[PDB]
Write a protein that binds this ligand. Structure first.
Ligand SMILES: [Cl-]
Ligand SMILES: [Cl-]
Ligand SMILES: [Cu+2]
Ligand SMILES: [Zn+2]
Length: 153
């Protein structure tokens, strides 16, 4: 099995430790953890393209999209590799992550290891919104916290 961790931080109170595990090189990836410091409600949660050693969430980039597809929710056939949907924060600002995904991988040509995990200010509209930007970013707005997805040490 391969394991990774992303430590989310930003310029504000949003932070958390996100774990990844992939038991087989072409098997599902499981993702879990908690994020604190969020406003109550849905927040977009994606793997972004950025893999340079830029300062925090200044150049997270577009979504990680090695197959040059349109934005969707995680269950949509047409989606970015990085499209992990939304997390939901409660009234005290904590969102629990619990995702099983078939599209991301920790291995091979399109590994997400080294890419940037991002949690957003607003909800992801899952590509179902009324503008072209829905089909790019889901209109999830600003990056509140980000971290490099690194192999577990
Ligand atoms: Cl925003
Ligand atoms: Cl803004
Ligand atoms: Cu994102
Ligand atoms: Zn996307």
């Amino acid at each position: 099995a391969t394991k990774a961790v992303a430590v989310l931080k930003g310029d504000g109170p949003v932070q958390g430790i996100i774990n990844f595990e992939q038991k087989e090189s072409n098997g599902p990836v499981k993702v879990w953890g908690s994020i604190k410091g969020l406003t109550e409600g849905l927040h977009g949660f994606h793997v972004h393209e950025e893999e340079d050693n830029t300062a925090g969430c200044t150049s997270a980039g577009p979504h990680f999209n090695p197959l040059s597809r349109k934005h969707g929710g995680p269950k949509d056939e047409e989606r970015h590799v990085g499209d992990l949907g939304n997390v939901t924060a409660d009234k005290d600002g904590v969102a629990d992550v619990s995702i099983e995904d078939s599209v991301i991988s920790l291995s091979g040509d399109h590994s997400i290891i080294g890419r940037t995990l991002v949690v957003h200010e607003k909800a992801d509209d899952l590509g179902k919104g009324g503008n072209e930007q829905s089909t790019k970013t889901g209109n999830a707005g600003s990056r509140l916290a980000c971290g490099v997805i690194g192999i577990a040490q």
